[PDB]
A paper describes a structure:
To extend on the structural repertoire of importin α structures, we tested whether these ARM repeats are similar in the structures of importin α isoforms that do not contain bound cargo. Importin α1 and α3, crystallised in P212121 and P1211 space groups, respectively, both contained one chain in the ASU. This is the first report of these adaptors being crystallised without cargo bound in the NLS-binding pockets, although a dimer of importin α1 has been reported previously. Superposition of importin α3 in the cargo free and bound forms showed that the N-terminal ARM repeats 1–4 are repositioned by up to 5 Å, consistent with previous findings that a more flexible hinge region is present in importin α315. However, the position of ARM repeats 7 and 8 was retained in both the cargo free and bound forms of importin α3. These results suggest that ARMs 7 and 8 do not undergo conformational changes to accommodate binding of the W NLS in either importin α1 or α3. In addition, we show through structural comparisons between apo- and W bound-importin α3, that structural changes in the N terminus were not associated with direct binding interactions in this region. The study by Sankhala et al. 15 indicated that the NLS of RCC1 binds in the major binding site of ARMS 2–4 of both importin α1 and α3, with additional interactions occurring at the N terminus of importin α3 ARM repeats 1–4 and the β-propeller region of RCC1, mediated by flexibility and rotation of importin α3 in ARM repeats 1–2. This mechanism of isoform specificity is well suited to cargo containing NLSs at the N terminus, and our structural data of the unbound and NLS-bound forms of importin α3 supports this model.
Author numbering: 72 to 486
Write the structure that this text describes.
């Protein structure tokens, strides 16, 4: 009797209330076809939200929290019905309940709400969720509960186009510093993905992450046995090394490069690609960082991937080679030449990704300009592998930066 349940829940007698709220909860969480929509149309939601305030009856508070949780675990329309009934401030309140089960049910409901979309997430942040959420992280916490805590932290951290507030980041980072030493794979995945979302927000957030002290704990996860950890960590440090040279050097000082031979040869193409992206951000640095890439014996592996990798990896390797020519010294570029970069580099001149074509022409141009006396030898190598015919054809490309640079190269070195 759904009507009866609604009427009884509104009674002043708290035991009849408990019976009714328990009945609604049992209708919702006990079957594989719950009547969620029917309970919403009944008008029960504001009653349950009122029940969440009853600290003097924790069984009633628990049951109402569980009912609303299960409604919020449903479809987007069901979660939004919960949000529109003003449930959120009451769940944030229940994060400070002394009763663990009410706290766990509040975390779960808030997770579903935050997951519905960006404005609900930003509402929950604006109401102060982070401090009480992170307060749960302790040595005695059950792992299932901690997993739900960390999932909510990731989801608070993930929609980036709204940058989360800086002060929230200051609250979240100490928790990540704690969690990065956890052994549970799901906790590590969530912690590191959260870090990678923070590190994608800009150089100032990168600096906050650096200043937290977490990078020497983060870098070694590049060699974790679990691939999900490896790929989260590779994203996080790659984003750090999109920052300044000094921020990149923070990563290098952790011996990051020692992890890369096993990433360039990893069976997963996605790890090869992400690793070469990382390296391309190292070679865009100063002469010493270029030399760090050379001295780690990584250049032959990059050139191999430039030649035989999947296109996404090939594009990243093209960037890594061309970026090396930005600040690299003549002898470092000469080392590239000795390692037979030219044929596979020139083989990318014919692809449909115009950005890659431009990158390759930029690198070839830089190489030719840098070889004071050997420019003729290098021009001959470019000719031998068909690079010259390809450059000649690029004079007719639609894109002005390409055809201009092809003309300039042809005028300076093959005329």
């Amino acid at each position: 009797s759904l009507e009866a349940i609604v009427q009884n829940a509104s009674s002043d007698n708290q035991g009849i209330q408990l019976s009714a709220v328990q009945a609604a909860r049992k209708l919702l969480s006990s079957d594989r076809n719950p009547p969620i929509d029917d309970l919403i149309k009944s008008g029960i939601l504001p009653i349950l939200v009122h029940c969440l305030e009853r600290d003097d009856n924790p069984s009633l508070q628990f049951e109402a929290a569980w009912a609303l949780t299960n409604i919020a675990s449903g479809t987007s329309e069901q979660t939004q019905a919960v949000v529109q009934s003003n449930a959120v401030p009451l769940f944030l309140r229940l994060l400070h309940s002394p009763h663990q089960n009410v706290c766990e049910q509040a975390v779960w409901a808030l997770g579903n709400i935050i997951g519905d979309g960006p404005q609900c997430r930003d509402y929950v942040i604006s109401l102060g969720v982070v401090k009480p959420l992170l307060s749960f992280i302790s040595p005695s916490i059950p792992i299932t509960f901690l997993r739900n805590v960390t999932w909510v932290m990731v989801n608070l951290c993930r929609h980036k186009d709204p940058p989360p507030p800086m002060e929230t980041i200051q609250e979240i980072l100490p928790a990540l510093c704690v969690l990065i030493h956890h052994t549970d794979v799901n906790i590590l995945v969530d912690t590191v993905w959260a870090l990678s979302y923070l590190t994608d927000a800009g150089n100032e957030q990168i600096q906050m992450v650096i200043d937290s002290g977490i990078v020497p704990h983060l870098v070694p996860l590049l060699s974790h046995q679990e691939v999900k950890v490896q790929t989260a960590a590779l994203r996080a440090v790659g984003n750090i090394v999109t920052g300044t040279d000094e921020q990149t050097q923070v990563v290098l000082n952790c011996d990051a490069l020692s992890h890369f031979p096993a990433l360039l040869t990893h069976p997963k193409e996605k790890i090869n690609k992400e690793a070469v992206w990382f390296l391309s951000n190292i070679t865009a640095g100063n002469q010493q960082q270029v030399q760090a890439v050379i001295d780690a014996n990584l250049v032959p592996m990059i050139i191999h991937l430039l030649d035989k990798g999947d296109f996404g990896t090939q594009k990243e390797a093209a960037w890594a080679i061309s970026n090396l020519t930005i600040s690299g010294r003549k002898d470092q570029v000469a080392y590239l030449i000795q390692q037979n970069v030219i044929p596979p580099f020139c083989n990318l001149l014919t692809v449909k990704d115009a950005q890659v074509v431009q990158v390759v022409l930029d690198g070839l141009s830089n190489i030719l300009k840098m070889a004071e006396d050997e420019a003729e030898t290098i021009g001959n190598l470019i000719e031998e592998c068909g690079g010259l015919e390809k450059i000649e054809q690029l004079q007719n490309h639609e894109n002005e930066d390409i055809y201009k640079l092809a003309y300039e190269i042809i005028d300076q070195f093959f005329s």
